[PDB]
Amino acid sequence: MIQRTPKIQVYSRHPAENGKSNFLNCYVSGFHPSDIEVDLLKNGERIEKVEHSDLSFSKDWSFYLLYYTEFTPTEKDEYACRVNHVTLSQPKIVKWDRDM
Amino acid sequence: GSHSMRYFFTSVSRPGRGEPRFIAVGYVDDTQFVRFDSDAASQRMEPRAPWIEQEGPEYWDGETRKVKAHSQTHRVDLGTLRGYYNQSEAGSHTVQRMYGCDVGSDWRFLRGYHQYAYDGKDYIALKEDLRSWTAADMAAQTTKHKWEAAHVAEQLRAYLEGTCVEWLRRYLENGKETLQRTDAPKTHMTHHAVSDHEATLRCWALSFYPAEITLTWQRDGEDQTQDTELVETRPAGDGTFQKWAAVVVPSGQEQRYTCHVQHEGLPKPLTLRWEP
Amino acid sequence: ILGKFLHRL
């Protein structure tokens, strides 16, 4: 059985400008098996209205998914992506950094 | 440029929990155009790009019949491989298949594929000649022999060099505005003080299509991969992609370093430099 | 379009 831990990136669709509508993205890639839990968080609380792409995979058979939600960033609000997978000993929470 | 059509299939067993999850997706280049998901409401092959929505009910009915037959195939495959490997009924396993075709700039056939993984590793694959098989182990030799007697390679060769290429050309004509475009990367540079002694330079490529890109750092003209970080190319969610590459450098020596960007949409590759 | 493929492992 191959198991691969996810790579996780949290970023915006467009350069972030406080008070301007945008999309917040959590891209999880390079993982195996396919079962994965992904939530977007706003100030630590899950966001319900999150969409995700159709499961696909790369040349090495590892999986990738994009999870995304419409949002308007402010200076005050903190965003993060929470991931759980069988390869993780506890869920991983990755904070949105606006230059990554 | 060259183009591809690829179909990707994933079947996942669910011990004690009924029928396998099955998900099929179709791509032209880096653009998804169809899906089927066993969890979804329609139980039909469905459009995922605008340009395919105009295919009529005969196309959808046909694609639905086939994709459901692909689902049933991989449902059986899960049971067969469990038997080949004498695995218990307790665990979840995965079968994946990809097939499809590449064409050159002339839109003529270049390469075909038809290959499988079991629990994340290669199981069997059609060789580039489209006449012979690579079996990963002694279980997969069983499948190879079976497929030789049933002349599976001959059938696949006919589809790959014929039907696959014909339809890829149809899709490239009818999805022209989306599929035949090139969007060159919008590039910039960012900088972070790490300490008195070190800085991070990050070279950005944004809003590009297709996904294929090369970002490299040089120091004094020399390829430099020590102390670099390159993230996986990622979807923006609007049909374009993003990537960045960073280097950690000694304070005050930033002018030695250059970022180089190669992309189909750039008639000359770009060189970026950072200044304070 | 998909192949009309029925072969099993």
Side-chain angles (χ1 to χ4, degrees), chain A residues 64, chain B residues 3-4 26-33 178-179 181 208-212 233 235 239-241 263-264:
Chain A
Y64 59 86
Chain B
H3 302 273
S4 63
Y27 278 85
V28 173
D29 302 328
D30 300 303
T31 308
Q32 188 185 358
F33 73 109
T178 293
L179 303 167
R181 80 197 202 272
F208 60 91
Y209 185 90
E212 172 50 28
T233 302
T240 70
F241 300 88
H263 192 271
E264 182 182 306

mmCIF file with all atom_site columns, all heavy atoms in Angstrom, chain A residues 64, chain B residues 3-4 26-33 178-179 181 208-212 233 235 239-241 263-264:
data_model
loop_
_atom_site.group_PDB
_atom_site.id
_atom_site.type_symbol
_atom_site.label_atom_id
_atom_site.label_alt_id
_atom_site.label_comp_id
_atom_site.label_asym_id
_atom_site.label_entity_id
_atom_site.label_seq_id
_atom_site.pdbx_PDB_ins_code
_atom_site.Cartn_x
_atom_site.Cartn_y
_atom_site.Cartn_z
_atom_site.occupancy
_atom_site.B_iso_or_equiv
_atom_site.pdbx_formal_charge
_atom_site.auth_seq_id
_atom_site.auth_comp_id
_atom_site.auth_asym_id
_atom_site.auth_atom_id
_atom_site.pdbx_PDB_model_num
ATOM 1   N N   . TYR A 1 64  ? -5.148  15.162 -6.269  1.00 0.00 ? 64  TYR A N   1
ATOM 2   C CA  . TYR A 1 64  ? -5.223  16.604 -5.942  1.00 0.00 ? 64  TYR A CA  1
ATOM 3   C C   . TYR A 1 64  ? -6.671  17.054 -5.955  1.00 0.00 ? 64  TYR A C   1
ATOM 4   O O   . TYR A 1 64  ? -7.471  16.546 -6.762  1.00 0.00 ? 64  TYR A O   1
ATOM 5   C CB  . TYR A 1 64  ? -4.345  17.496 -6.836  1.00 0.00 ? 64  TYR A CB  1
ATOM 6   C CG  . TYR A 1 64  ? -4.673  17.412 -8.331  1.00 0.00 ? 64  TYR A CG  1
ATOM 7   C CD1 . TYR A 1 64  ? -5.656  18.198 -8.896  1.00 0.00 ? 64  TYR A CD1 1
ATOM 8   C CD2 . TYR A 1 64  ? -4.018  16.501 -9.163  1.00 0.00 ? 64  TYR A CD2 1
ATOM 9   C CE1 . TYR A 1 64  ? -5.958  18.178 -10.260 1.00 0.00 ? 64  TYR A CE1 1
ATOM 10  C CE2 . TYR A 1 64  ? -4.324  16.447 -10.522 1.00 0.00 ? 64  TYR A CE2 1
ATOM 11  C CZ  . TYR A 1 64  ? -5.287  17.276 -11.069 1.00 0.00 ? 64  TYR A CZ  1
ATOM 12  O OH  . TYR A 1 64  ? -5.609  17.167 -12.415 1.00 0.00 ? 64  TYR A OH  1
ATOM 13  N N   . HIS B 2 3   ? -1.130  19.015 -27.974 1.00 0.00 ? 3   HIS B N   1
ATOM 14  C CA  . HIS B 2 3   ? -2.338  18.951 -27.128 1.00 0.00 ? 3   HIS B CA  1
ATOM 15  C C   . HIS B 2 3   ? -2.560  17.490 -26.670 1.00 0.00 ? 3   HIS B C   1
ATOM 16  O O   . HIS B 2 3   ? -2.029  16.553 -27.301 1.00 0.00 ? 3   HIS B O   1
ATOM 17  C CB  . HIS B 2 3   ? -3.607  19.489 -27.844 1.00 0.00 ? 3   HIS B CB  1
ATOM 18  C CG  . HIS B 2 3   ? -3.496  20.910 -28.321 1.00 0.00 ? 3   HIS B CG  1
ATOM 19  N ND1 . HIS B 2 3   ? -3.795  21.986 -27.522 1.00 0.00 ? 3   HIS B ND1 1
ATOM 20  C CD2 . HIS B 2 3   ? -3.101  21.417 -29.517 1.00 0.00 ? 3   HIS B CD2 1
ATOM 21  C CE1 . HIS B 2 3   ? -3.584  23.106 -28.211 1.00 0.00 ? 3   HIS B CE1 1
ATOM 22  N NE2 . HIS B 2 3   ? -3.157  22.785 -29.423 1.00 0.00 ? 3   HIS B NE2 1
ATOM 23  N N   . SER B 2 4   ? -3.280  17.345 -25.556 1.00 0.00 ? 4   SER B N   1
ATOM 24  C CA  . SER B 2 4   ? -3.662  16.039 -25.031 1.00 0.00 ? 4   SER B CA  1
ATOM 25  C C   . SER B 2 4   ? -5.164  15.943 -24.678 1.00 0.00 ? 4   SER B C   1
ATOM 26  O O   . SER B 2 4   ? -5.829  16.926 -24.392 1.00 0.00 ? 4   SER B O   1
ATOM 27  C CB  . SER B 2 4   ? -2.799  15.739 -23.830 1.00 0.00 ? 4   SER B CB  1
ATOM 28  O OG  . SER B 2 4   ? -3.055  16.704 -22.823 1.00 0.00 ? 4   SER B OG  1
ATOM 29  N N   . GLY B 2 26  ? -12.626 13.944 -17.349 1.00 0.00 ? 26  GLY B N   1
ATOM 30  C CA  . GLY B 2 26  ? -12.001 14.076 -18.675 1.00 0.00 ? 26  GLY B CA  1
ATOM 31  C C   . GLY B 2 26  ? -11.391 15.485 -18.807 1.00 0.00 ? 26  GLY B C   1
ATOM 32  O O   . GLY B 2 26  ? -11.996 16.465 -18.386 1.00 0.00 ? 26  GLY B O   1
ATOM 33  N N   . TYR B 2 27  ? -10.166 15.564 -19.359 1.00 0.00 ? 27  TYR B N   1
ATOM 34  C CA  . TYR B 2 27  ? -9.432  16.785 -19.621 1.00 0.00 ? 27  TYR B CA  1
ATOM 35  C C   . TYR B 2 27  ? -9.010  16.917 -21.092 1.00 0.00 ? 27  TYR B C   1
ATOM 36  O O   . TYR B 2 27  ? -8.672  15.896 -21.727 1.00 0.00 ? 27  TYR B O   1
ATOM 37  C CB  . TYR B 2 27  ? -8.127  16.776 -18.815 1.00 0.00 ? 27  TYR B CB  1
ATOM 38  C CG  . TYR B 2 27  ? -8.288  17.198 -17.381 1.00 0.00 ? 27  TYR B CG  1
ATOM 39  C CD1 . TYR B 2 27  ? -8.663  16.280 -16.459 1.00 0.00 ? 27  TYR B CD1 1
ATOM 40  C CD2 . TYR B 2 27  ? -7.998  18.510 -16.947 1.00 0.00 ? 27  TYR B CD2 1
ATOM 41  C CE1 . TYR B 2 27  ? -8.793  16.654 -15.093 1.00 0.00 ? 27  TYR B CE1 1
ATOM 42  C CE2 . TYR B 2 27  ? -8.127  18.897 -15.591 1.00 0.00 ? 27  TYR B CE2 1
ATOM 43  C CZ  . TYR B 2 27  ? -8.589  17.956 -14.709 1.00 0.00 ? 27  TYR B CZ  1
ATOM 44  O OH  . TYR B 2 27  ? -8.734  18.249 -13.366 1.00 0.00 ? 27  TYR B OH  1
ATOM 45  N N   . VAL B 2 28  ? -9.049  18.148 -21.609 1.00 0.00 ? 28  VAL B N   1
ATOM 46  C CA  . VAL B 2 28  ? -8.260  18.532 -22.782 1.00 0.00 ? 28  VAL B CA  1
ATOM 47  C C   . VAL B 2 28  ? -7.187  19.482 -22.263 1.00 0.00 ? 28  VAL B C   1
ATOM 48  O O   . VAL B 2 28  ? -7.498  20.558 -21.719 1.00 0.00 ? 28  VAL B O   1
ATOM 49  C CB  . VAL B 2 28  ? -9.064  19.192 -23.891 1.00 0.00 ? 28  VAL B CB  1
ATOM 50  C CG1 . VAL B 2 28  ? -8.137  19.708 -25.000 1.00 0.00 ? 28  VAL B CG1 1
ATOM 51  C CG2 . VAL B 2 28  ? -10.007 18.182 -24.551 1.00 0.00 ? 28  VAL B CG2 1
ATOM 52  N N   . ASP B 2 29  ? -5.913  19.092 -22.431 1.00 0.00 ? 29  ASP B N   1
ATOM 53  C CA  . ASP B 2 29  ? -4.810  19.907 -21.885 1.00 0.00 ? 29  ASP B CA  1
ATOM 54  C C   . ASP B 2 29  ? -5.029  20.070 -20.372 1.00 0.00 ? 29  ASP B C   1
ATOM 55  O O   . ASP B 2 29  ? -5.290  19.077 -19.728 1.00 0.00 ? 29  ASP B O   1
ATOM 56  C CB  . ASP B 2 29  ? -4.651  21.209 -22.640 1.00 0.00 ? 29  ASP B CB  1
ATOM 57  C CG  . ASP B 2 29  ? -4.408  20.989 -24.123 1.00 0.00 ? 29  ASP B CG  1
ATOM 58  O OD1 . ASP B 2 29  ? -3.773  19.961 -24.474 1.00 0.00 ? 29  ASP B OD1 1
ATOM 59  O OD2 . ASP B 2 29  ? -4.776  21.843 -24.948 1.00 0.00 ? 29  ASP B OD2 1
ATOM 60  N N   . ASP B 2 30  ? -4.958  21.291 -19.829 1.00 0.00 ? 30  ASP B N   1
ATOM 61  C CA  . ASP B 2 30  ? -5.201  21.484 -18.423 1.00 0.00 ? 30  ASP B CA  1
ATOM 62  C C   . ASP B 2 30  ? -6.661  21.903 -18.080 1.00 0.00 ? 30  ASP B C   1
ATOM 63  O O   . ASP B 2 30  ? -6.907  22.496 -17.010 1.00 0.00 ? 30  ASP B O   1
ATOM 64  C CB  . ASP B 2 30  ? -4.194  22.506 -17.891 1.00 0.00 ? 30  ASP B CB  1
ATOM 65  C CG  . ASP B 2 30  ? -2.757  22.039 -18.089 1.00 0.00 ? 30  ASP B CG  1
ATOM 66  O OD1 . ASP B 2 30  ? -2.440  20.954 -17.603 1.00 0.00 ? 30  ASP B OD1 1
ATOM 67  O OD2 . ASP B 2 30  ? -1.988  22.712 -18.726 1.00 0.00 ? 30  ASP B OD2 1
ATOM 68  N N   . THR B 2 31  ? -7.586  21.723 -19.023 1.00 0.00 ? 31  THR B N   1
ATOM 69  C CA  . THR B 2 31  ? -8.960  22.125 -18.847 1.00 0.00 ? 31  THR B CA  1
ATOM 70  C C   . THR B 2 31  ? -9.869  20.914 -18.706 1.00 0.00 ? 31  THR B C   1
ATOM 71  O O   . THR B 2 31  ? -9.985  20.101 -19.638 1.00 0.00 ? 31  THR B O   1
ATOM 72  C CB  . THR B 2 31  ? -9.421  23.037 -20.002 1.00 0.00 ? 31  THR B CB  1
ATOM 73  O OG1 . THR B 2 31  ? -8.516  24.146 -20.190 1.00 0.00 ? 31  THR B OG1 1
ATOM 74  C CG2 . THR B 2 31  ? -10.829 23.525 -19.770 1.00 0.00 ? 31  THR B CG2 1
ATOM 75  N N   . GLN B 2 32  ? -10.501 20.786 -17.521 1.00 0.00 ? 32  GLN B N   1
ATOM 76  C CA  . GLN B 2 32  ? -11.492 19.748 -17.312 1.00 0.00 ? 32  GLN B CA  1
ATOM 77  C C   . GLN B 2 32  ? -12.756 20.016 -18.171 1.00 0.00 ? 32  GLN B C   1
ATOM 78  O O   . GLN B 2 32  ? -13.189 21.177 -18.270 1.00 0.00 ? 32  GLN B O   1
ATOM 79  C CB  . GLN B 2 32  ? -11.899 19.661 -15.816 1.00 0.00 ? 32  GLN B CB  1
ATOM 80  C CG  . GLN B 2 32  ? -12.762 18.452 -15.598 1.00 0.00 ? 32  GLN B CG  1
ATOM 81  C CD  . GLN B 2 32  ? -13.322 18.339 -14.185 1.00 0.00 ? 32  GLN B CD  1
ATOM 82  O OE1 . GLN B 2 32  ? -13.028 19.169 -13.343 1.00 0.00 ? 32  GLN B OE1 1
ATOM 83  N NE2 . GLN B 2 32  ? -14.208 17.366 -13.960 1.00 0.00 ? 32  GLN B NE2 1
ATOM 84  N N   . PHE B 2 33  ? -13.300 18.974 -18.813 1.00 0.00 ? 33  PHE B N   1
ATOM 85  C CA  . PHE B 2 33  ? -14.542 19.175 -19.623 1.00 0.00 ? 33  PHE B CA  1
ATOM 86  C C   . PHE B 2 33  ? -15.729 18.264 -19.304 1.00 0.00 ? 33  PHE B C   1
ATOM 87  O O   . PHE B 2 33  ? -16.878 18.637 -19.638 1.00 0.00 ? 33  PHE B O   1
ATOM 88  C CB  . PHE B 2 33  ? -14.281 19.194 -21.124 1.00 0.00 ? 33  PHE B CB  1
ATOM 89  C CG  . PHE B 2 33  ? -13.968 17.836 -21.713 1.00 0.00 ? 33  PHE B CG  1
ATOM 90  C CD1 . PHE B 2 33  ? -14.884 17.181 -22.533 1.00 0.00 ? 33  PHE B CD1 1
ATOM 91  C CD2 . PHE B 2 33  ? -12.699 17.291 -21.571 1.00 0.00 ? 33  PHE B CD2 1
ATOM 92  C CE1 . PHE B 2 33  ? -14.578 15.929 -23.038 1.00 0.00 ? 33  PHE B CE1 1
ATOM 93  C CE2 . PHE B 2 33  ? -12.394 16.039 -22.106 1.00 0.00 ? 33  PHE B CE2 1
ATOM 94  C CZ  . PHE B 2 33  ? -13.341 15.372 -22.839 1.00 0.00 ? 33  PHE B CZ  1
ATOM 95  N N   . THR B 2 178 ? -11.130 29.020 -25.519 1.00 0.00 ? 178 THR B N   1
ATOM 96  C CA  . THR B 2 178 ? -10.600 28.539 -24.247 1.00 0.00 ? 178 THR B CA  1
ATOM 97  C C   . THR B 2 178 ? -9.337  27.713 -24.447 1.00 0.00 ? 178 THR B C   1
ATOM 98  O O   . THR B 2 178 ? -8.327  27.893 -23.721 1.00 0.00 ? 178 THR B O   1
ATOM 99  C CB  . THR B 2 178 ? -11.653 27.646 -23.550 1.00 0.00 ? 178 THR B CB  1
ATOM 100 O OG1 . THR B 2 178 ? -12.745 28.464 -23.178 1.00 0.00 ? 178 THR B OG1 1
ATOM 101 C CG2 . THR B 2 178 ? -11.130 26.820 -22.243 1.00 0.00 ? 178 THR B CG2 1
ATOM 102 N N   . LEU B 2 179 ? -9.392  26.769 -25.383 1.00 0.00 ? 179 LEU B N   1
ATOM 103 C CA  . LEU B 2 179 ? -8.345  25.752 -25.465 1.00 0.00 ? 179 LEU B CA  1
ATOM 104 C C   . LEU B 2 179 ? -7.162  26.157 -26.289 1.00 0.00 ? 179 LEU B C   1
ATOM 105 O O   . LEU B 2 179 ? -6.076  25.710 -26.014 1.00 0.00 ? 179 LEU B O   1
ATOM 106 C CB  . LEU B 2 179 ? -8.908  24.446 -26.013 1.00 0.00 ? 179 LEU B CB  1
ATOM 107 C CG  . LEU B 2 179 ? -10.062 23.887 -25.226 1.00 0.00 ? 179 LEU B CG  1
ATOM 108 C CD1 . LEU B 2 179 ? -10.677 22.792 -26.087 1.00 0.00 ? 179 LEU B CD1 1
ATOM 109 C CD2 . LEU B 2 179 ? -9.590  23.349 -23.855 1.00 0.00 ? 179 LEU B CD2 1
ATOM 110 N N   . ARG B 2 181 ? -5.903  29.185 -26.507 1.00 0.00 ? 181 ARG B N   1
ATOM 111 C CA  . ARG B 2 181 ? -5.293  30.414 -26.021 1.00 0.00 ? 181 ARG B CA  1
ATOM 112 C C   . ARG B 2 181 ? -3.992  30.148 -25.269 1.00 0.00 ? 181 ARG B C   1
ATOM 113 O O   . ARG B 2 181 ? -3.729  29.032 -24.725 1.00 0.00 ? 181 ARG B O   1
ATOM 114 C CB  . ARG B 2 181 ? -6.248  31.140 -25.070 1.00 0.00 ? 181 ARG B CB  1
ATOM 115 C CG  . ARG B 2 181 ? -6.258  30.570 -23.637 1.00 0.00 ? 181 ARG B CG  1
ATOM 116 C CD  . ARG B 2 181 ? -7.494  31.034 -22.884 1.00 0.00 ? 181 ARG B CD  1
ATOM 117 N NE  . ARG B 2 181 ? -7.286  30.953 -21.449 1.00 0.00 ? 181 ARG B NE  1
ATOM 118 C CZ  . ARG B 2 181 ? -7.518  29.886 -20.676 1.00 0.00 ? 181 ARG B CZ  1
ATOM 119 N NH1 . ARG B 2 181 ? -7.948  28.747 -21.175 1.00 0.00 ? 181 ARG B NH1 1
ATOM 120 N NH2 . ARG B 2 181 ? -7.235  29.950 -19.381 1.00 0.00 ? 181 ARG B NH2 1
ATOM 121 N N   . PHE B 2 208 ? -1.470  32.512 -15.581 1.00 0.00 ? 208 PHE B N   1
ATOM 122 C CA  . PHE B 2 208 ? -0.950  31.871 -16.792 1.00 0.00 ? 208 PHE B CA  1
ATOM 123 C C   . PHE B 2 208 ? -1.717  30.636 -17.209 1.00 0.00 ? 208 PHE B C   1
ATOM 124 O O   . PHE B 2 208 ? -2.306  29.901 -16.347 1.00 0.00 ? 208 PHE B O   1
ATOM 125 C CB  . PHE B 2 208 ? 0.590   31.626 -16.741 1.00 0.00 ? 208 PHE B CB  1
ATOM 126 C CG  . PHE B 2 208 ? 1.069   30.727 -15.608 1.00 0.00 ? 208 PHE B CG  1
ATOM 127 C CD1 . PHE B 2 208 ? 1.179   29.364 -15.822 1.00 0.00 ? 208 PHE B CD1 1
ATOM 128 C CD2 . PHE B 2 208 ? 1.474   31.266 -14.347 1.00 0.00 ? 208 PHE B CD2 1
ATOM 129 C CE1 . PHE B 2 208 ? 1.615   28.540 -14.779 1.00 0.00 ? 208 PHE B CE1 1
ATOM 130 C CE2 . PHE B 2 208 ? 1.919   30.460 -13.330 1.00 0.00 ? 208 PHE B CE2 1
ATOM 131 C CZ  . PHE B 2 208 ? 1.990   29.089 -13.535 1.00 0.00 ? 208 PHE B CZ  1
ATOM 132 N N   . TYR B 2 209 ? -1.684  30.390 -18.520 1.00 0.00 ? 209 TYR B N   1
ATOM 133 C CA  . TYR B 2 209 ? -2.255  29.206 -19.154 1.00 0.00 ? 209 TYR B CA  1
ATOM 134 C C   . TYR B 2 209 ? -1.509  28.914 -20.449 1.00 0.00 ? 209 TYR B C   1
ATOM 135 O O   . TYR B 2 209 ? -1.276  29.852 -21.230 1.00 0.00 ? 209 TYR B O   1
ATOM 136 C CB  . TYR B 2 209 ? -3.773  29.364 -19.463 1.00 0.00 ? 209 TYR B CB  1
ATOM 137 C CG  . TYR B 2 209 ? -4.391  28.071 -20.011 1.00 0.00 ? 209 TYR B CG  1
ATOM 138 C CD1 . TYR B 2 209 ? -4.942  27.123 -19.125 1.00 0.00 ? 209 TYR B CD1 1
ATOM 139 C CD2 . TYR B 2 209 ? -4.391  27.780 -21.373 1.00 0.00 ? 209 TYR B CD2 1
ATOM 140 C CE1 . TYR B 2 209 ? -5.492  25.948 -19.610 1.00 0.00 ? 209 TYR B CE1 1
ATOM 141 C CE2 . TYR B 2 209 ? -4.931  26.571 -21.875 1.00 0.00 ? 209 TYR B CE2 1
ATOM 142 C CZ  . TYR B 2 209 ? -5.495  25.654 -20.967 1.00 0.00 ? 209 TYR B CZ  1
ATOM 143 O OH  . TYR B 2 209 ? -6.014  24.440 -21.366 1.00 0.00 ? 209 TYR B OH  1
ATOM 144 N N   . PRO B 2 210 ? -1.128  27.651 -20.725 1.00 0.00 ? 210 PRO B N   1
ATOM 145 C CA  . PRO B 2 210 ? -1.322  26.448 -19.864 1.00 0.00 ? 210 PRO B CA  1
ATOM 146 C C   . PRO B 2 210 ? -0.430  26.373 -18.674 1.00 0.00 ? 210 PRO B C   1
ATOM 147 O O   . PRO B 2 210 ? 0.302   27.285 -18.419 1.00 0.00 ? 210 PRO B O   1
ATOM 148 C CB  . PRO B 2 210 ? -1.088  25.259 -20.824 1.00 0.00 ? 210 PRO B CB  1
ATOM 149 C CG  . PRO B 2 210 ? -0.356  25.794 -21.968 1.00 0.00 ? 210 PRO B CG  1
ATOM 150 C CD  . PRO B 2 210 ? -0.509  27.309 -22.012 1.00 0.00 ? 210 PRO B CD  1
ATOM 151 N N   . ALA B 2 211 ? -0.540  25.279 -17.918 1.00 0.00 ? 211 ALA B N   1
ATOM 152 C CA  . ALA B 2 211 ? 0.100   25.164 -16.601 1.00 0.00 ? 211 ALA B CA  1
ATOM 153 C C   . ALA B 2 211 ? 1.625   24.990 -16.678 1.00 0.00 ? 211 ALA B C   1
ATOM 154 O O   . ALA B 2 211 ? 2.310   25.380 -15.747 1.00 0.00 ? 211 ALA B O   1
ATOM 155 C CB  . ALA B 2 211 ? -0.540  24.046 -15.776 1.00 0.00 ? 211 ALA B CB  1
ATOM 156 N N   . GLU B 2 212 ? 2.129   24.434 -17.767 1.00 0.00 ? 212 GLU B N   1
ATOM 157 C CA  . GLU B 2 212 ? 3.538   24.158 -17.939 1.00 0.00 ? 212 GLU B CA  1
ATOM 158 C C   . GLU B 2 212 ? 4.311   25.494 -17.827 1.00 0.00 ? 212 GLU B C   1
ATOM 159 O O   . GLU B 2 212 ? 4.020   26.396 -18.519 1.00 0.00 ? 212 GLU B O   1
ATOM 160 C CB  . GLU B 2 212 ? 3.756   23.513 -19.328 1.00 0.00 ? 212 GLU B CB  1
ATOM 161 C CG  . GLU B 2 212 ? 5.185   23.306 -19.779 1.00 0.00 ? 212 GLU B CG  1
ATOM 162 C CD  . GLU B 2 212 ? 6.074   22.623 -18.751 1.00 0.00 ? 212 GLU B CD  1
ATOM 163 O OE1 . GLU B 2 212 ? 5.553   21.849 -17.921 1.00 0.00 ? 212 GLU B OE1 1
ATOM 164 O OE2 . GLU B 2 212 ? 7.325   22.818 -18.769 1.00 0.00 ? 212 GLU B OE2 1
ATOM 165 N N   . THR B 2 233 ? 2.777   23.962 -8.943  1.00 0.00 ? 233 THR B N   1
ATOM 166 C CA  . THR B 2 233 ? 1.905   24.847 -9.719  1.00 0.00 ? 233 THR B CA  1
ATOM 167 C C   . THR B 2 233 ? 0.459   24.559 -9.273  1.00 0.00 ? 233 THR B C   1
ATOM 168 O O   . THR B 2 233 ? 0.082   23.376 -9.054  1.00 0.00 ? 233 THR B O   1
ATOM 169 C CB  . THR B 2 233 ? 2.076   24.576 -11.227 1.00 0.00 ? 233 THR B CB  1
ATOM 170 O OG1 . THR B 2 233 ? 3.436   24.765 -11.626 1.00 0.00 ? 233 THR B OG1 1
ATOM 171 C CG2 . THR B 2 233 ? 1.141   25.382 -12.131 1.00 0.00 ? 233 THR B CG2 1
ATOM 172 N N   . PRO B 2 235 ? -3.921  25.851 -9.203  1.00 0.00 ? 235 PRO B N   1
ATOM 173 C CA  . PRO B 2 235 ? -5.028  26.530 -9.917  1.00 0.00 ? 235 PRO B CA  1
ATOM 174 C C   . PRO B 2 235 ? -5.472  27.765 -9.179  1.00 0.00 ? 235 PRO B C   1
ATOM 175 O O   . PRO B 2 235 ? -5.644  27.757 -7.904  1.00 0.00 ? 235 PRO B O   1
ATOM 176 C CB  . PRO B 2 235 ? -6.155  25.473 -9.966  1.00 0.00 ? 235 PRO B CB  1
ATOM 177 C CG  . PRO B 2 235 ? -5.908  24.614 -8.742  1.00 0.00 ? 235 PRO B CG  1
ATOM 178 C CD  . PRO B 2 235 ? -4.406  24.701 -8.425  1.00 0.00 ? 235 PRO B CD  1
ATOM 179 N N   . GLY B 2 239 ? -9.523  29.260 -14.337 1.00 0.00 ? 239 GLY B N   1
ATOM 180 C CA  . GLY B 2 239 ? -8.945  28.741 -15.570 1.00 0.00 ? 239 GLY B CA  1
ATOM 181 C C   . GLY B 2 239 ? -7.413  28.994 -15.752 1.00 0.00 ? 239 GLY B C   1
ATOM 182 O O   . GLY B 2 239 ? -6.853  28.426 -16.707 1.00 0.00 ? 239 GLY B O   1
ATOM 183 N N   . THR B 2 240 ? -6.785  29.816 -14.895 1.00 0.00 ? 240 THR B N   1
ATOM 184 C CA  . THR B 2 240 ? -5.336  30.055 -14.893 1.00 0.00 ? 240 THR B CA  1
ATOM 185 C C   . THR B 2 240 ? -4.637  29.395 -13.715 1.00 0.00 ? 240 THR B C   1
ATOM 186 O O   . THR B 2 240 ? -5.279  28.885 -12.770 1.00 0.00 ? 240 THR B O   1
ATOM 187 C CB  . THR B 2 240 ? -5.000  31.564 -14.902 1.00 0.00 ? 240 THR B CB  1
ATOM 188 O OG1 . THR B 2 240 ? -5.343  32.151 -13.621 1.00 0.00 ? 240 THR B OG1 1
ATOM 189 C CG2 . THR B 2 240 ? -5.759  32.248 -16.042 1.00 0.00 ? 240 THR B CG2 1
ATOM 190 N N   . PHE B 2 241 ? -3.313  29.448 -13.760 1.00 0.00 ? 241 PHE B N   1
ATOM 191 C CA  . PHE B 2 241 ? -2.457  28.904 -12.773 1.00 0.00 ? 241 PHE B CA  1
ATOM 192 C C   . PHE B 2 241 ? -1.464  29.910 -12.163 1.00 0.00 ? 241 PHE B C   1
ATOM 193 O O   . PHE B 2 241 ? -1.318  31.058 -12.653 1.00 0.00 ? 241 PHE B O   1
ATOM 194 C CB  . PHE B 2 241 ? -1.721  27.729 -13.393 1.00 0.00 ? 241 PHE B CB  1
ATOM 195 C CG  . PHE B 2 241 ? -2.632  26.639 -13.870 1.00 0.00 ? 241 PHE B CG  1
ATOM 196 C CD1 . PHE B 2 241 ? -3.164  26.651 -15.150 1.00 0.00 ? 241 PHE B CD1 1
ATOM 197 C CD2 . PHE B 2 241 ? -2.952  25.569 -13.038 1.00 0.00 ? 241 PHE B CD2 1
ATOM 198 C CE1 . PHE B 2 241 ? -4.048  25.653 -15.603 1.00 0.00 ? 241 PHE B CE1 1
ATOM 199 C CE2 . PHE B 2 241 ? -3.838  24.577 -13.466 1.00 0.00 ? 241 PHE B CE2 1
ATOM 200 C CZ  . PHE B 2 241 ? -4.354  24.582 -14.777 1.00 0.00 ? 241 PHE B CZ  1
ATOM 201 N N   . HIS B 2 263 ? 7.825   30.333 -20.439 1.00 0.00 ? 263 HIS B N   1
ATOM 202 C CA  . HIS B 2 263 ? 6.441   30.006 -20.698 1.00 0.00 ? 263 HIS B CA  1
ATOM 203 C C   . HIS B 2 263 ? 6.103   30.183 -22.185 1.00 0.00 ? 263 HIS B C   1
ATOM 204 O O   . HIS B 2 263 ? 6.599   31.093 -22.864 1.00 0.00 ? 263 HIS B O   1
ATOM 205 C CB  . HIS B 2 263 ? 5.478   30.829 -19.798 1.00 0.00 ? 263 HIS B CB  1
ATOM 206 C CG  . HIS B 2 263 ? 4.060   30.342 -19.818 1.00 0.00 ? 263 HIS B CG  1
ATOM 207 N ND1 . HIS B 2 263 ? 3.139   30.787 -20.731 1.00 0.00 ? 263 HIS B ND1 1
ATOM 208 C CD2 . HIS B 2 263 ? 3.395   29.453 -19.026 1.00 0.00 ? 263 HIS B CD2 1
ATOM 209 C CE1 . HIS B 2 263 ? 1.970   30.208 -20.523 1.00 0.00 ? 263 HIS B CE1 1
ATOM 210 N NE2 . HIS B 2 263 ? 2.096   29.395 -19.484 1.00 0.00 ? 263 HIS B NE2 1
ATOM 211 N N   . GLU B 2 264 ? 5.211   29.319 -22.657 1.00 0.00 ? 264 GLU B N   1
ATOM 212 C CA  . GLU B 2 264 ? 4.715   29.339 -24.039 1.00 0.00 ? 264 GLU B CA  1
ATOM 213 C C   . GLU B 2 264 ? 4.232   30.710 -24.524 1.00 0.00 ? 264 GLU B C   1
ATOM 214 O O   . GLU B 2 264 ? 4.436   31.085 -25.675 1.00 0.00 ? 264 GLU B O   1
ATOM 215 C CB  . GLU B 2 264 ? 3.563   28.342 -24.117 1.00 0.00 ? 264 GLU B CB  1
ATOM 216 C CG  . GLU B 2 264 ? 2.891   28.137 -25.446 1.00 0.00 ? 264 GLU B CG  1
ATOM 217 C CD  . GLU B 2 264 ? 1.742   27.131 -25.280 1.00 0.00 ? 264 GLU B CD  1
ATOM 218 O OE1 . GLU B 2 264 ? 1.997   26.002 -24.753 1.00 0.00 ? 264 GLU B OE1 1
ATOM 219 O OE2 . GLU B 2 264 ? 0.572   27.463 -25.638 1.00 0.00 ? 264 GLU B OE2 1
#
